[PDB]
Design a protein around this ligand. Structure first.
Ligand SMILES: O=c1[nH]c(=O)c2ccccc2o1
Ligand SMILES: O=c1[nH]c(=O)c2ccccc2o1
Lengths: 216, 215
């Protein structure tokens, strides 16, 4: 039984969480996902969440005051606070497995050029905080990364249930003049196992040589 | 000017990214994102999209006849066919830049067990196909990865999303003191060469700590 809170200035973007696996997990009561509009914790009439950076630079930085009030209300000392950021530690399969046993995840979605560093620093005095990157590309905000993290974690939760997988096939055995590899039709478990292992090897060498300790 | 077609059995997953697009960019014809339900190309009253894997094992594999029909209708010779898969080549910022100049992306969202490999192999005989992974973790399906790819690519197309080595260091804004923590004084110094050097050192330390692979 897991609780996930997501905090964002675009709560509408997190609605895909209601589809597929995450939606099913919600419907089965294995997780509760709540999405919160950060602007709820603002007090000015313009509901400002960002300001220009100290020391200069392009863009805006999200204000610590608003985030601090939001996290005060949402988090407890048991919370794992997840902050997606291109400058984060890598989020990997190992991370997904680790977080799959947490009682409470809170995901802070940043926009503009990021969140004032003191938000994470202050939070870390009261709870565990993890700044993570889902990959080596830049997004406009943390919302898509939140969806990725939720999907990668939820499919591992006990309630629901290296090298690259090789090609897979299904019916019909011949299509547009392309045949399923005969060994897959042969019913020989030993030979199928070996062919699949080999396929996995070739694909990994080709597409992800780093997984086998080779130069990219 | 870019067209993106997404094919998925969960078309609702993609609707917020469509409502993410600035009216100005659509009216200027710079971008169009369309989402298609894969089941429109199913053959049977049960609208079947997957089937048991040849050679045995768990899960299901998506049907080649269904995907073949869908791509036949949607793709052209100019299309870049993107297939998200945990078994893919890595999708990187370099990839995003490359794809940002394309006229037509089609993103085929499958379950993680996969789409029958003959679909990609057939498509590759008449268009460019890219099987890609957005990171070292497994998702249940390609839809979340589609969202990531669309966002990473379109923010590099001039004026579309509304937005204008080493890791970025910490950032700060007002107030100068908050919950006992002061903004580093150097940032308020008006010595802009020194600020640049300080930021460089912050970047170096953070990269060493979090991403030593980058060095
Ligand atoms: O994991 C990530 N990568 C990003 O690219 C990213 C960008 C802005 C805000 C949050 C983010 O999270
Ligand atoms: O990049 C990815 N990673 C996945 O893990 C993934 C899983 C299923 C389908 C598509 C996918 O794309």
């Amino acid at each position: 039984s897991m609780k996930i809170d997501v905090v964002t200035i675009f709560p509408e973007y997190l609605q895909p969480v209601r589809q597929s696996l995450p939606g099913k997990a919600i419907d089965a009561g294995l997780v509760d996902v709540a999405v919160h509009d950060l602007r709820r914790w603002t007090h000015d009439v313009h509901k400002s969440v960002d300001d220009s950076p100290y020391g200069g630079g392009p863009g805006m930085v999200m204000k610590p005051t608003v985030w601090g009030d939001a996290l005060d209300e949402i988090c407890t000392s048991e919370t794992l606070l997840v902050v997606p950021t291109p400058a984060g530690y890598p989020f990997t399969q190992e991370t997904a497995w680790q977080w799959s046993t947490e009682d409470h995840l809170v995901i802070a979605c940043g926009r503009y050029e990021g969140i004032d560093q003191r938000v994470a620093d202050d939070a870390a005095t009261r709870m565990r905080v993890r700044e993570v990157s889902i990959g080596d590309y830049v997004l406009n905000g943390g919302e898509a990364a939140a969806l990725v993290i939720i999907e990668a974690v939820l499919r591992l939760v006990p309630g629901v249930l290296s090298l690259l997988e090789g090609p897979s096939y299904t019916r019909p055995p011949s299509w547009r003049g392309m045949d399923v590899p005969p060994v897959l039709l042969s019913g020989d478990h030993a030979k199928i196992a070996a062919w699949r292992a080999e396929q996995s090897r070739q694909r990994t060498i080709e597409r992800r040589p780093d997984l086998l300790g080779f130069d990219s």
